[PDB]
Symmetry: C5
Subunit: 339 residues, 5 copies
Amino acid sequence: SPSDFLDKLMGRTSGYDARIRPNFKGPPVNVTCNIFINSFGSIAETTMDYRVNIFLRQKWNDPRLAYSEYPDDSLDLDPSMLDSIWKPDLFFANEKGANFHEVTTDNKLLRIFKNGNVLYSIRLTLTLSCPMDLKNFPMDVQTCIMQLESFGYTMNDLIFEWQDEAPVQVAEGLTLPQFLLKEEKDLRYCTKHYNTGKFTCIEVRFHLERQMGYYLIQMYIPSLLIVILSWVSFWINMDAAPARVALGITTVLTMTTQSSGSRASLPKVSYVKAIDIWMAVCLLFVFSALLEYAAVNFVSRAGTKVFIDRAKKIDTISRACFPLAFLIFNIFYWVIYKI
Amino acid sequence: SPSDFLDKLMGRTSGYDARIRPNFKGPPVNVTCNIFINSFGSIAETTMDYRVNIFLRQKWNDPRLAYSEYPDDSLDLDPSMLDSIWKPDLFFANEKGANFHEVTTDNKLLRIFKNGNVLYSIRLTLTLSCPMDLKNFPMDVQTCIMQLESFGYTMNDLIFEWQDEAPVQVAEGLTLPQFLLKEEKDLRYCTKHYNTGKFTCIEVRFHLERQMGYYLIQMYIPSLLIVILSWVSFWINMDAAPARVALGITTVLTMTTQSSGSRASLPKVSYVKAIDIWMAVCLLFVFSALLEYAAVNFVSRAGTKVFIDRAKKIDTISRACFPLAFLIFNIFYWVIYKI
Amino acid sequence: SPSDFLDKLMGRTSGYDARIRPNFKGPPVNVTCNIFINSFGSIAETTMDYRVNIFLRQKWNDPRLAYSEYPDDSLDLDPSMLDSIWKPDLFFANEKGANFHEVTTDNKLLRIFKNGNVLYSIRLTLTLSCPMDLKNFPMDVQTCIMQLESFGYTMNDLIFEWQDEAPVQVAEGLTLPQFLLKEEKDLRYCTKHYNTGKFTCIEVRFHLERQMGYYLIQMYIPSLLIVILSWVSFWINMDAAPARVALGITTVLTMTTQSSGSRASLPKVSYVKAIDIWMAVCLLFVFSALLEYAAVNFVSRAGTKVFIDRAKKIDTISRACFPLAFLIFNIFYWVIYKI
Amino acid sequence: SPSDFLDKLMGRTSGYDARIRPNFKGPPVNVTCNIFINSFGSIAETTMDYRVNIFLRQKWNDPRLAYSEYPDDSLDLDPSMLDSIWKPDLFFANEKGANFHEVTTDNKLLRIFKNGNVLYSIRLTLTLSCPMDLKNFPMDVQTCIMQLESFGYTMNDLIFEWQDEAPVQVAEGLTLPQFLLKEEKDLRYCTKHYNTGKFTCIEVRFHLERQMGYYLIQMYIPSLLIVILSWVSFMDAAPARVALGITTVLTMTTQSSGSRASLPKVSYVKAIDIWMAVCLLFVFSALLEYAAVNFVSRAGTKVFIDRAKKIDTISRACFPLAFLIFNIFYWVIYKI
Amino acid sequence: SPSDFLDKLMGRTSGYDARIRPNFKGPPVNVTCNIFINSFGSIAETTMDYRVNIFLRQKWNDPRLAYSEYPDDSLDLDPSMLDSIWKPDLFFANEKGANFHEVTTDNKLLRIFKNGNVLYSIRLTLTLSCPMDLKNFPMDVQTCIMQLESFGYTMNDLIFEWQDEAPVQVAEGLTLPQFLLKEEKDLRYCTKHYNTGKFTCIEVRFHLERQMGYYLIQMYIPSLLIVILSWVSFWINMDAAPARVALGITTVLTMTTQSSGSRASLPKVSYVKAIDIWMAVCLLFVFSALLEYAAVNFVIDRAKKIDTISRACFPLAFLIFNIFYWVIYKI
Ligand SMILES: *[C@@H]1O[C@H](CO)[C@@H](O[C@@H]2O[C@H](CO)[C@@H](O)[C@H](O)[C@H]2NC(C)=O)[C@H](O)[C@H]1NC(C)=O
Ligand SMILES: *[C@@H]1O[C@H](CO)[C@@H](O[C@@H]2O[C@H](CO)[C@@H](O)[C@H](O)[C@H]2NC(C)=O)[C@H](O)[C@H]1NC(C)=O
Ligand SMILES: O=C1C[C@@H]2OCC=C3CN4CC[C@]56c7ccccc7N1[C@H]5[C@H]2[C@H]3C[C@H]46
Ligand SMILES: O=C1C[C@@H]2OCC=C3CN4CC[C@]56c7ccccc7N1[C@H]5[C@H]2[C@H]3C[C@H]46
Ligand SMILES: O=C1C[C@@H]2OCC=C3CN4CC[C@]56c7ccccc7N1[C@H]5[C@H]2[C@H]3C[C@H]46
Ligand SMILES: O=C1C[C@@H]2OCC=C3CN4CC[C@]56c7ccccc7N1[C@H]5[C@H]2[C@H]3C[C@H]46
Ligand SMILES: O=C1C[C@@H]2OCC=C3CN4CC[C@]56c7ccccc7N1[C@H]5[C@H]2[C@H]3C[C@H]46
Ligand SMILES: *[C@@H]1O[C@H](CO)[C@@H](O)[C@H](O)[C@H]1NC(C)=O
Ligand SMILES: *[C@@H]1O[C@H](CO)[C@@H](O)[C@H](O)[C@H]1NC(C)=O
Ligand SMILES: *[C@@H]1O[C@H](CO)[C@@H](O)[C@H](O)[C@H]1NC(C)=O
């Protein structure tokens, strides 16, 4: 008769008040938290948040519930009866959205042990805020957090602490479409301070390194191929007008359809992303490679025997300068965005 | 037994009626309001609103709840019992939608003190309407508000008032993907006047300043360069049929593959914006420079000396007209939108 | 004790029943409606609906709630006990979805007066269906409505009625991203006749004038410019292959990149809009101008005396005919879609 | 006091049990169903479904509720008391999600008549699944159904039935952005069979005919025009002919990628897709045809320029002939 | 009076308690599950999941509910009274989202038979995280699962089992916009092991092959035709500048518009797909054919020497890469 033994511990004749905490008069209650992340995803930068599906598990002691007389060494309080026992008011500080699960039954479990220790396993969906900076897109790396805090109880009455062993665990094979969730999860404190008191808070931080593979092959490399076709105009005489104009116009026009083609499938933000610079710089090196040939024609238009040497002087310079100047920019870009 | 002493104040024996307000006979209830914004964003012109996540603290006095004999200086009421006390009918006048949070327990707190003061903290999500004007895009600024009004109670019975120090606070590091949330939050009244009565209302106003970075680098700067290349056609003589046509075709064609490219990420509004003008004006100047050469070539079609003077005049005029015409427009443009 | 006096009118020893309507014996209950519109937007051609946030104020007489003995001249029933009083089965006929607002408290009010009148104010979100025809887009106009109907009472027992003074009001400074909301609101009856009886229904019509600007500057104008550039090829001699060909190519290619450029931002429907004609006609005029050169070159190919005369005669007509034809089309078009 | 006379028929002393059906021992309960569609829309092939807004109206007989002593010849059960009377366990078999409506009051009605008939009108939003095949897009036509089945009662205890006169009506002036809802709906029976019994089920079938107008004017016709300029290019004019061949290919490839953004998301081939791929050949091969001419006429002699006159003369009456053969095939297949 | 007999079995006087399981003293409760699927859909790499619609059916034995005295040999408990009977604490381990149905009545059914057997059928909407690798688009294949685990009960007290006959059925006619539901579903155990115990879990594997039709006609073939135009320029002599220059420029400019025309109808992932390699390889082959002519014009014996090689090598080198490609992405 375990269900029956419980309402002797919880009921009218027991004298249990779930509105009152354990050790009411004396020291604080110690709640040992740990989670399991079964699902991690929907990281959006427009709403600046991410969704996670977890099992939260709180463990604590309530000496009001300790027993001995009964043979079975642990009792399972029914989900519907959960009001009838005190439990901590842990909430997620940075939660935007939240809900419990109730299919097929309530996804909640409570075990009170013989020594009074309680075990509370509960399954949640959680939308949490993660302020995001795309400055270095697409070589950026984000840091999302998750704060377990007490709502009304202070440090004088309630204290949260992580598990010593694997407090935060993540399901095997979980994938994100754009980031990689890293294996390191930094645990730390966030104990808040207000003029209304001091409140317990424990934190876990996830790290999210973005992937480039797509932008590398479908944007950086093709733009590099076009900037290489900009330089071959230099290795032709001034007399061949059709080639150097057509190439220059192609190179410019092709680079322009590429920089516009990309824009529709990039994160829509107001500030300058690292990718936005690459497109701009690549446009100069295509633009000026056409503007170079215009400067050659303006000097070598007057077909004097002397200045054709000094006009071909521009071309001999550019043959070494444009490849070098590009490589000086290139070496800056990848060193800065892979420091 | 603080929870038991509490329901001596609330219970049938007390004679407390939660439908009735404090000081029901005479003067109005003074309610002191303040908020902490933990999340700000989802600012959308499409639905013309924004989304916030807040704490809302409310402090008033109830002389019925005051007590003395009991030791503990403040009693807190359970979140399941809130309806047994009176509380103010505060609602957000420009709420498109709202709700509470109840994970893991109800995110609500109430403290009633020995003196009779009641402190009521509530966590909330609100979607509030923010009528927006994008006439000056992307050099616009917006002003989203937030009104705390009383529903049923008039000025005679209820008054809402902000805190003196730091009434409306905002969490650290809350980035937005487009706007910048300014430090200045203005505080005023919105007391409503209907035939049915006067109604207390307080208001806090935010200021949002849109960033340009991306549009400056992907639109303005690139377009500026394509318009200058349009002018160099003037500096070539009439004989160079390939060059002058090649530039005119490239410039227009390149200007067009930028305008279509930029449309992708423009805000969804069916009216004219600052950005749209610029793009249309830059089209005219690129189009008409090619149209000018058509008028030059048409005049010198007649190969006599009278007409070659007429056609030589057009270019030499155009060399110092287009750059003046542009500058005069450019001066207007940037002066108007950065007044 | 105004709370206590109410439940003397409603409670056990009163004999009042909420299920029964006022004047149950004979004549119908005249309900007086009026709304205030705080929010208006989310107009979609995909879901073919719109979203409004409103107050709704119903007013009727219940002689059963008449009193005098009690000092105060009006009582307010609590939002929780609205079930204990009769109120009209008013529902919105074209509602797709709707909700009450209950933050921070239930956003409802109900006064019962000394003479037995009622005043029921209620805040509501409504998604209403609005069939929309985009045949003339973007020079179209839509007329969304809003019907207040009784669910189960006929005109014999229940009649709805608008107010005489400002029965429908819209908040100051609301804005829509695509449409303009006109100040005129047509009021009328929608009384429904079924085989089960005749039911009360009252309707308010809003009219929406779609905004043009963006499509004018970003699509109509550029398309016009590209048509003008098609005509400049008539002002070069038949000889110049590079120019006359390259113009025709640019114009046709450029024109096409815009029609598809616009597609991504147009309201996605399967039928022909007015803008879709424009782009298609503009395509003909650009295509046929290139086609005209092909005929000219086709004729004068056999370069004798008679052929080059008849070939040159085409271009001379084309300089007049094409702009004339376009102007005739253009006058018809804009006169038809702005009759 | 009609309210009070009702709870005389329902209350403790009446011996009414809402959990037990009418005609409990004997014959099957006959329920006549009919719907009024106020909204029909949100038809998506991504989630593969559509969204309706309807008035369901169920009529059955309950001899336990028949009366006579009361003057009023029909009694209205309040929506709050709906638990207190037996009513059918109707459910929409192909519903992905539904809900009720409750603004301002509960959007429900019940009427029990003097003779025992019950009349239960209710208001719903349904999201019904509609499998959708886009092989012939945009010349396709879809069929979306709606099944009203009994959850737990079998053919022996419960049978569903459409009204004889106009059981499924649709509201005046309802527009869809892509489809046209056809006037003729069909009615039939979906009566299900399992090991656990035979369950009544009635069904209505809507037909949805997609519109082409837009795709005709801004896609099909243009592609026909560029295919014409592939034929006008039909020796010496090297800058012109090759430019006409090149332009067609450029202007075609911009039209192909131009549409892709607007088209529906499906990984299989559509009719629209074939057209563009076919029209890409007829343009691509026109330029490819002149590369055979320029390869043969490159050797400037008597026999080479005569052989290079044979190619352009055939293509003036072969490409138009070949296209027209394919064209007639295409349109006759996608409009039988 | 079957409704009045039930609350004799369940009610106060019986001493039945739904908080306690059948065979509480000793051996496990054997539940036998099975599902009908009326909707597999909303597969989404962005959220990394699909939303399914099902009937679930659980059958077990409860000897506290056995009877014989009553004539009718099976009783139907009302959906409203489902609290007052024990039933398994089944949950889907890989649910992100799920819900019951309430229209028009509660879509649930419970029969208790003469021999204490309970038969519980319930209608549900789920959403099940399906981690998808997309590295071989659009020749990829994806194995979505669905786990039915016991929340609180171990293997000592509760065991799930699929039906022996047609445990997982799928409704006729269903279609997907991008994939196929492969006929063969797998079944297996997932039984979880923890430090708190060993929990019963049964699972079904749906396989889904993605379709290539759209990308074949609108991408792979048009990319091939452009690469064929890259080879015709070789056959032209070194003299013809406009012809060979116009080809390369057309070939490049055409290949750029297709490769950007695809971007719109590709899935939202940051990593390299197989489609991307093909687009990037078909750039090189166009790009280099133009770059070859630059070496020919930058160099009459050696200038005509390069053209004769690239008529054979480029169609071959392509064919060599191509063979690897389709063999690696169709092993
Ligand atoms: C419900 O419908 C069935 C079928 O129409 C009815 O059963 C018939 O009853 C008539 C007389 O009422 C007989 O003549 C037929 O032979 C019956 N046919 C069948 C197939 O049963 C039934 O009576 C109807 N009404 C109820 C149950 O009240
Ligand atoms: C439920 O399932 C298992 C396997 O069918 C049964 O387990 C057997 O239980 C009996 C009686 O306690 C033991 O003697 C056997 O050794 C068990 N065999 C096993 C585990 O392989 C169980 O009895 C079944 N039915 C019940 C408990 O009603
Ligand atoms: O009076 C307050 C306002 C302040 O609001 C910001 C959020 C806070 C987080 N928790 C939520 C409830 C609160 C609290 C607890 C006990 C008495 C007063 C009280 N609050 C908030 C407070 C902080 C700290 C604490
Ligand atoms: O009679 C009214 C209608 C009017 O509706 C718009 C909104 C208003 C804001 N609050 C909400 C309830 C209301 C009010 C209070 C007491 C008696 C009548 C009454 N109302 C609304 C009124 C205003 C003012 C007030
Ligand atoms: O019998 C009916 C069905 C019919 O269905 C379409 C909608 C209607 C709108 N209201 C809702 C309830 C209804 C009504 C009132 C009283 C008795 C029967 C009854 N109904 C519906 C009816 C119409 C009219 C009315
Ligand atoms: O045992 C079952 C499983 C089967 O599942 C598919 C759907 C069905 C539709 N309704 C829902 C409940 C059901 C039923 C009724 C009475 C006893 C058992 C039972 N069910 C399901 C059944 C079919 C038929 C019926
Ligand atoms: O203590 C725990 C935490 C752990 O959480 C991950 C999920 C699990 C699946 N079910 C859910 C409840 C749980 C369980 C049952 C009985 C005592 C403790 C307990 N739990 C979770 C546990 C595993 C196993 C089991
Ligand atoms: C709980 O909290 C602290 C930290 O370990 C400690 O002082 C105290 O003894 C702990 N144990 C209790 C209250 O039982
Ligand atoms: C509340 O404020 C008003 C005005 O500030 C004042 O008249 C009143 O006395 C104050 N205090 C109360 C009503 O307790
Ligand atoms: C309601 O209006 C009707 C129509 O004018 C009138 O006949 C009736 O007397 C009015 N008042 C009632 C029924 O109380």
